[PDB]
Amino acid sequence: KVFGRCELAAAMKRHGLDNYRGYSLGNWVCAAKFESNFNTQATNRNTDGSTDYGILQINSRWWCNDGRTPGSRNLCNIPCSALLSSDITASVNCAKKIVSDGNGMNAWVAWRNRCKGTDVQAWIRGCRL
Numbered sequence: 520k521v522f523g524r525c526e527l528a529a530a531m532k533r534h535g536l537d538n539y540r541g542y543s544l545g546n547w548v549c550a551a552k553f554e555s556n557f558n559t560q561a562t563n564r565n566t567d568g569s570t571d572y573g574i575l576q577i578n579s580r581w582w583c584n585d586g587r588t589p590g591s592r593n594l595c596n597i598p599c600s601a602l603l604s605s606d607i608t609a610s611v612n613c614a615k616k617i618v619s620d621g622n623g624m625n626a627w628v629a630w631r632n633r634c635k636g637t638d639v640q641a642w643i644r645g646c647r648l
């Protein structure tokens with residue numbers, strides 16, 4: 520599923536991300552944009568052999584089991600395949616654990632480089648929420 524901007528903002532808002540650990544909805548939507556281009560099916564291999572999965576590009580090194588990332592954790596207790604659903608529940612619920620980690624949204628390289636300290640509110644303007 521490739522979500523529209525306001526469509527993802529609404530779905531993220533429902534699943535409890537709006538100002539979750541202090542990050543406004545616009546951060547999460549900006550994060551999704553630059554991580555996955557709003558595509559629930561997005562996969563990208565990292566240089567270390569791990570893979571990032573789904574709309575928020577959750578990494579196999581720590582958070583999910585994909586059965587080809589040796590010596591890695593599954594801190595969200597899920598198959599990485601669950602993160603590629605058109606239903607974002609699992610991605611959202613695993614992102615909540617990630618962002619609570621104590622590094623906050625800095626764990627998303629695209630958020631830090633492209634969203635952090637920008638006008639993230641632009642990512643929800645004109646959306647009904």
Ligand SMILES: [Au+]
Nearest residue numbers: 534608611612
């Ligand atoms: Au959720």
Ligand SMILES: [Au+]
Nearest residue numbers: 547550624627
């Ligand atoms: Au994020």
Ligand SMILES: [Au+]
Nearest residue numbers: 530606607608
């Ligand atoms: Au959803």
Ligand code: NA
Nearest residue numbers: 579583591592
């Ligand atoms: Na893993």
